[PDB]
Amino acid sequence: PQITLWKRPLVTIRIGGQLKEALLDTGADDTVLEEMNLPGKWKPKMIGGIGGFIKVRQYDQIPIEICGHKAIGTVLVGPTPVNIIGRNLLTQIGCTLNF
Amino acid sequence: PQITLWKRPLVTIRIGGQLKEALLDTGADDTVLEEMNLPGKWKPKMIGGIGGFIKVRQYDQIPIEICGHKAIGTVLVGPTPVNIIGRNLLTQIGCTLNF
Numbered sequence: 561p562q563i564t565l566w567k568r569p570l571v572t573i574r575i576g577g578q579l580k581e582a583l584l585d586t587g588a589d590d591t592v593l594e595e596m597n598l599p600g601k602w603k604p605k606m607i608g609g610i611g612g613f614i615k616v617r618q619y620d621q622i623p624i625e626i627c628g629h630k631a632i633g634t635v636l637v638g639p640t641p642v643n644i645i646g647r648n649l650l651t652q653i654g655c656t657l658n659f
Numbered sequence: 660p661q662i663t664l665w666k667r668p669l670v671t672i673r674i675g676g677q678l679k680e681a682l683l684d685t686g687a688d689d690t691v692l693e694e695m696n697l698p699g700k701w702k703p704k705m706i707g708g709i710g711g712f713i714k715v716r717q718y719d720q721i722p723i724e725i726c727g728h729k730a731i732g733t734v735l736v737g738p739t740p741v742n743i744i745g746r747n748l749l750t751q752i753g754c755t756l757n758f
């Protein structure tokens with residue numbers, strides 16, 4: 561799709577069999593989801609945003625379907641204000657900015 | 660132009676007499692610039708993201724040029740680690756997400 565920006569670019573994602581709403585976030589390097597359970601190994605990590613740093617759990621090689629497009633990559637889980645899809649997965653689904 | 664997301668979507672912007680590098684950020688409702696002593700009236704504001712909140716100064720109707728496209732609107736100024744062009748200005752320069 562072409563998505564305009566007068567509204568938040570919120571899309572439905574499917575991950576671990578569950579449907580969630582998430583924000584397409586070109587200002588995010590990484591994909592960060594609110595507290596949830598995911599299967600398999602994870603590693604502690606820290607990431608920075610506008611207000612400082614948080615601790616997250618890094619899950620590698622996780623499939624997510626983002627607005628009908630498949631990605632498999634790194635998903636960070638922690639106290640983000642909202643589920644965000646970052647550039648690591650935006651690139652996988654062929655997302656560009658255009659003006 | 661079309662901007663891929665392999666790297667951060669940083670572009671040159673102009674505000675006041677200063678050229679700066681700024682992120683084209685679909686995940687940002689607002690435009691948030693690094694500390695700078697702009698003229699005019701402002702109002703205090705708090706904005707929140709990963710890590711928590713920062714205190715900013717809200718300046719209204721500030722002209723900004725983003726990649727040679729003219730925009731004018733609200734700019735938040737404060738101790739952000741990166742200059743952020745948010746949706747309030749991205750719409751003005753005709754920016755969309757496409758995949």
Ligand SMILES: CNC(=O)CCC(=O)N[C@@H](Cc1ccccc1)[C@H](O)CN(CC1CC1)S(=O)(=O)c1cccc(OC)c1
Nearest residue numbers: 587588589590607608609610686687688689706707708709
């Ligand atoms: C590994 N770190 C990252 O991927 C950064 C994630 C991130 O927080 N991105 C943000 C931009 C940023 C901030 C600080 C440094 C670098 C980029 C993000 O794209 C925009 N952020 C909101 C997203 C939910 C997090 S935000 O910067 O916090 C923001 C901007 C404008 C208005 C806001 O609230 C009204 C909030």
